[PDB]
Amino acid sequence: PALPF
Amino acid sequence: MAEELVLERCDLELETNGRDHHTADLCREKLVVRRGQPFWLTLHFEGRNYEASVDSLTFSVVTGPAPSQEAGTKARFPLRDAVEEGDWTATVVDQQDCTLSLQLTTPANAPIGLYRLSLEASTGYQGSSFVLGHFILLFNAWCPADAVYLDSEEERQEYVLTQQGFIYQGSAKFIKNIPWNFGQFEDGILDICLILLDVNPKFLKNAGRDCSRRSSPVYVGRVVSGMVNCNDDQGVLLGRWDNNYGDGVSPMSWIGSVDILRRWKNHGCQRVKYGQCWVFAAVACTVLRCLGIPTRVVTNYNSAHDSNLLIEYFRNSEMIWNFHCWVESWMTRPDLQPGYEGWQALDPTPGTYCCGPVPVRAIKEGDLSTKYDAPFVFAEVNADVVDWIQKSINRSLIVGLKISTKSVGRDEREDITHTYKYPEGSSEEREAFTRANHGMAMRIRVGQSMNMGSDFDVFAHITNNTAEEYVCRLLLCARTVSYNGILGPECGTKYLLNLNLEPFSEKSVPLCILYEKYRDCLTESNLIKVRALLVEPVINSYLLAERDLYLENPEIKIRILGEPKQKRKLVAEVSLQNPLPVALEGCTFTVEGAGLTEEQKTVEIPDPVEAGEEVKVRMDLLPLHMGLHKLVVNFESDKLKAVKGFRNVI
Ligand SMILES: [Cl-]
Secondary structure, three states, X not given: OXXXX | OOOOOXXXXXXXXXXXXXXXXXXXXXXXXXXXEEOOOOEEEEEEEXXXXXXXXXXXXXXXXXXXXXXXXXXXXXXXXXXXXXOOXXXXXXXXXXXXXXXXXXXXXXXXXXXXXXXXXXXXXXXXXXXXXXXXXXXXXXXXXXXXXXXXXXXXXXXXXXXXXXXXXXXXXXXXXXXXXXXXXXXXXXXXXXXXXHHHHHOOHHHHHHHHHHHHHOOOHHHHHHHHHHOOOOOOOOOOEEEOOOOOOOOOOOOOOOOEOHHHHHXXXXXXXXXXXXXXXXXXXXXXXXXXXXHOOOEEEEEEEEEEOOOOHHHHHHHOOOOOEOEEEEEEEEEOOOOOXXXXXXXXXXXXXXXXXOOOOEEHHHXXXXXXXXXXXXXXXXXXXXXXEEEEOOOOEOOOEEEEEEEEEEOXXXXXXEEOHHHHOOOOOOHHHHHHHHHHOOOOEEEEEOOOOOEOOOOEEEEEEEEEOOOOOEEEEEEEEEEEEOOOOXXXXXEEEEEEEEEEEOOOEEEEEEXXXXXXXXXXXXXXXXXEEEEEEEEEOOOOEEEEEEEEEEOEXXXXXXXXXXXXXXXXXXXXXXXXXXXXOOOEOOOEEEEEOOOOOOOOEEEEOOOOEOXXXXXXXXXXXXXXXXXXXXXXXXXXXXXXXXXXXXXXXX
């Protein structure tokens, strides 16, 4: 998945 | 005497056309051809054949719902030997008994899309107009005169014709190659792409002008972009990033564009569920490749290291992710200044048309006034982060790592980071940082002094020393911190979404630190760590400032009752003022000091002490010798322990 920091 | 011609039929020559125009897969049922290049029709006639001396033939083409010659969406042209360069022409290349072989050319700047072909056969005194059929006109990377021209066959094969590639996921240090079916030449896709265009906002706004403008690969790319993820219902994909995809299909599940396009159409052009960056880019890539614009998916990687305030700022849209994928397309940019022909970045992920196309060279040069949406792309591969803790570049966060794409005609990754960014610390990388982000500094302040017990203000003191107003975001927060490095719960937080900084000005932004907050979550340290994060979100530059704060204990007042002669006759006065707003229970003093006493005088207190209410005690001292002597005191309470103090004498 595209993951937010 | 001569009779008018009767067309038996029109042969579209789907094979030789599909071959020469590189549309063999798209020419199963229907003629599709690329612009700026001759294609072939063969007229079969019933009876007499064409005779140039007798018959005059004209053709008419229209595309779209409001064709007009001035807009380029309509054209009439004769059948004749003289063939002008770059115009709509038709000429004869073969003539047998019954057949007449025609060769048609379109301008290299012809609008793409569906056309209806009509023929008017005028024989002497008469004439008869009628429809031949339809061809679809696409972009032509093989055509030197075309804006999407691309001079390498291997690249034309890769970025237009190849229907599988790799999309790069993972992290900077663990890259994974995920295979993908673009399938731009599968059944239905070409039509669905054409539909995507004819539902786009600019088409509804002005269908005629829209169809005219589909001559521009800039225009189409821009349109192709903001339609994959529209805020409308007409958009193709719905994004979701919360591992809750039970409603539809999982972003990770997809292995192709095709099935998404179909679902979208087959359900009245309604968002398919669900997508993420790389699914949007693949979908855009498919649509763009289909229409003939050389395109590729790219992955940019970020990495973040140490609860650093940046991590905290995000932990709880335009944010920083583990990776992000967009597409690049190949075209000239005569809308811009000279020298921006080449790769143009397009971001179909969340004019509504965002983002792009913008030249990749514009990003590396930091010419962020170059259309379209240069700062947004720049932000995706540039983040400047700086600390102050009394300048000092921070590296808890790196953006613009291993920007990746599939190599031409090989099952390999190609690192294209150099196209976006100059080498770190280079004359160019600085030169370009300038051109982008045309004195700004921040520290922590207290002002008045801090007492364990009391409430007090801390300030983010920001100074816009430059002439440029900035619109920043400010997080200003405080947590308790331990002598051995641990961090405690929040005891003060102020977030400000909009903080303007008028030129050549300053601000001191208060946060209140309340006893109620910190008092019960404190350690023996008496340490509060204040931290301000200042975001300029356009350029994606950050200022961090941190400062540790010691909540001092209350002073013990000590006074010398009596006279200082090298004899006797002295008494001790020792007072403390409770700084808390609470009953301070079980109070006691200790006093001692060699040369003043040889009897540590412990005095207990039966009366609980209030807020502000001080507490005096006494002690008789019998000094002995002459020189310097220091009395030493300790204080204890239920909730306030180990507050020392001393006083010199003689
Ligand atoms: Cl007209």
